[PDB]
Amino acid sequence: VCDATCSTIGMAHYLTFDGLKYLFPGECQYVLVQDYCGSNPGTFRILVGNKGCSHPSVKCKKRVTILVEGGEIELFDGEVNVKRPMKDETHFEVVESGRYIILLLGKALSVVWDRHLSISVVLKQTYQEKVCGLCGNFDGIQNNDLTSSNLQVEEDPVDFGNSWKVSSQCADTRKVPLDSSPATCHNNIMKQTMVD
Amino acid sequence: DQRVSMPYASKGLYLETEAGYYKLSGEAYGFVARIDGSGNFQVLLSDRYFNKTCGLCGNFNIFAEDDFMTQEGTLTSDPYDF
Amino acid sequence: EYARTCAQEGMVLYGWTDHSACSPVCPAGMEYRQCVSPCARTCQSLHINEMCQERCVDGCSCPEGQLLDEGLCVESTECPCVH
């Protein structure tokens, strides 16, 4: 079995490990992925936090806070920032090669960041169903990547991510009326074909 | 004019409730407002506007006597016409 | 007001409302604590820690147990689920 790969294509979409594009415009802070899931120690707790990103625009600067080995290293606005160095500095590593910030954290973990929005965490063979969050469980089964925090499969992913937010008193996002044209392209058929 | 539900988080303005009291955060724009149950407006604001924000809560300087600088810019003795 | 004004300056005060015979209004289930954490551990919550290093804030909050669920305090045993 090969190394899976999340992604955050554009402002509001998510690609799971097993491979499942789905839509989730949120504005609160959300659990991209973690290990503390049911009956396990809880080693790493990668998070993601967006601001003004329910409608994609030149706005929506992300904030990423990753919690491993009792550490707190986070990044936004181009650079990375350490708030609490972790104990085992040996596995730590940062490679600012090209557009990206490649970022190792251990034998079986890695992260990538295009300095603008993309978040592509990369895992190894080690876990094989030890995680949960937005990216799902990493089991090979692709339809069980909507297993909400309350341990059931949903069908409408807008209700999925609302379970995984951190601040349980901030805003749950609104079920949008589905349509093939977003806000501007809605009733502007001309512009739709120049983008198409 | 459209009444929305609560909480609410558009445009970088989380509109939350903390400790049973309502909050409005703008950390990108450098302010945190809130209200209590009785009604007591409060405004927390960064050090970035030191000697900037002129208004009804006065400038963010060190002094406390000179913080009536009108919309013209005029040190006034009356806390009322200001 | 004088309580909070001293609190903001880096020097908090405690328990002053015990004998003052005035507590600020709050909805049912809660009354005015002093210096409660903003990250109130509620019912439908993920058990995560040492991210909320924010400063300590005044305001009314639930009893020791009695977790929050939709604007009221409710006992930890009766935590619902959602679908």
Ligand SMILES: *[C@@H]1O[C@H](CO)[C@@H](O)[C@H](O)[C@H]1NC(C)=O
């Ligand atoms: C404040 O700003 C004014 C003009 O805006 C300037 O004249 C003054 O030197 C500054 N100093 C203080 C203490 O505000």
Ligand SMILES: [Ca+2]
């Ligand atoms: Ca899966």
Ligand SMILES: [Ca+2]
């Ligand atoms: Ca002043």
